[PDB]
């Protein structure tokens, strides 16, 4: 049904947006050993890492994305990857693309005569999914530079990517159905 499809697509869009917004704004991206001052269990996110045990429990410290190493013989690829991870450009791009898809799906309901808004929403949703993929790869690969595990914030982003792709599929299906109905009306 058109109403069922619209409800499912809107619900998925909102759920994905909320999950990704929580993922960006939370500090449970990774569990690893470290120091929250300036080596106990630490939970890390995108911008800050905090300890979970010991005397320094509950203290959060900002992530140093540019460590003061010897720095000799440094390829620009590592600096570019570190800058991409520090700026979190792809998670933020995914957030903005999801929000723009949500506005497009909202606009189509108030602009039912216009059909390319739904296609734009689908494009935005699948682009947000691809942005999620690139951001996840960037974050994991930057983590490379001995036991670690990811919290629910990382898996929140994973489910956000999956839901965004599913919602994009549903939006493109709605576009197909609208154009097919228009063609059938024109034929008769």
């Amino acid at each position: 049904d058109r109403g069922v499809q619209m409800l499912l697509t809107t619900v998925g869009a909102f759920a994905a947006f909320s999950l990704m917004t929580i993922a960006v704004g939370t500090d449970y991206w990774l569990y690893s050993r470290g120091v929250c001052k300036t080596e106990v269990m630490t939970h890390s996110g995108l911008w800050r890492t905090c300890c979970l045990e010991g005397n320094f429990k509950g203290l959060c410290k900002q992530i140093d994305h540019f460590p003061e190493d010897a720095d000799y013989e440094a390829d620009t690829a590592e600096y570019f990857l570190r800058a991409v991870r520090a700026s979190s450009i792809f998670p933020i791009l995914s957030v903005i693309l999801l929000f723009m898809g949500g506005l497009c799906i909202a606009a189509s309901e108030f602009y039912k005569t216009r059909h390319n808004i739904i296609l734009s929403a689908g494009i935005f949703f699948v682009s947000a999914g691809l942005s999620n993929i690139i951001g996840i790869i960037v974050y994991i690969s930057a983590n490379a530079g001995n036991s670690y595990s990811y919290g629910w914030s990382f898996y929140f982003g994973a489910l956000s990517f999956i839901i965004a792709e599913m919602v994009g599929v549903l939006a493109v299906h709605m576009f197909i159905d609208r154009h097919k109905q228009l063609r059938a009306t024109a034929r008769a």
């Binding site: 296609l119 689908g122 494009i123 699948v126 999914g129 691809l130 993929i133 996840i136 790869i137 994991i140 994973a158 990517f161 999956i162 792709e165 994009g168 599929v169 493109v172 576009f175 197909i176 154009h179 097919k180 063609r183 059938a184 034929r187």
Partner: protein, 149 residues
């Protein structure tokens, strides 16, 4: 102490997760570029290609499994997706086979205890497929009984 799923050892968990993510993304993009354009539909309305979302996922799985398929993309964007997926698949599967050959040579015949996991996966897949087939048959039978009344 290798487990029942020791055949997944050559690649890391992150690689497997990103493989699933990439498979989903490639299939969705294939469906999008195959079916979004109204000019690719002609006259119900029948598309110029058999690349729905289900068929796109089947094509992507066949490409990654080195097994082939009965359909192939014909448009420029669909073929771009297919070619980039072929390149990714070749690299990933070749890397898996090379690292597996390295892992198995750390001449002793392989034992069943090393592939029991893949056997279990095969039987679980067979059971799941049978369950879906019977559920679909029951749904169709119930619909036919309701329509006959």
């Amino acid at each position: 102490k290798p487990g029942v799923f020791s055949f997944l050892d050559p690649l890391a968990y992150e690689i497997w997760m990103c493989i699933v993510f990439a498979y989903i993304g490639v299939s969705v993009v294939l469906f999008l570029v195959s079916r979004f354009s109204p000019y690719e539909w002609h006259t119900s309305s029948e598309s110029t290609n058999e690349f729905g979302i289900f068929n796109s996922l089947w094509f992507s799985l066949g490409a990654f499994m080195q097994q082939g398929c009965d359909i192939s993309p014909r448009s420029l964007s669909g073929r771009i997706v297919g070619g980039v997926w072929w390149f990714f698949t070749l690299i990933i599967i070749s890397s898996y086979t090379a690292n597996l050959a390295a892992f198995l040579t750390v001449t002793s015949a392989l034992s069943l205890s090393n592939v029991a996991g893949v056997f279990y996966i095969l039987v679980g897949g067979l059971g799941l497929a049978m369950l879906v087939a019977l559920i679909e048959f029951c749904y169709k039978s119930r619909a036919e009984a309701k329509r006959m009344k």
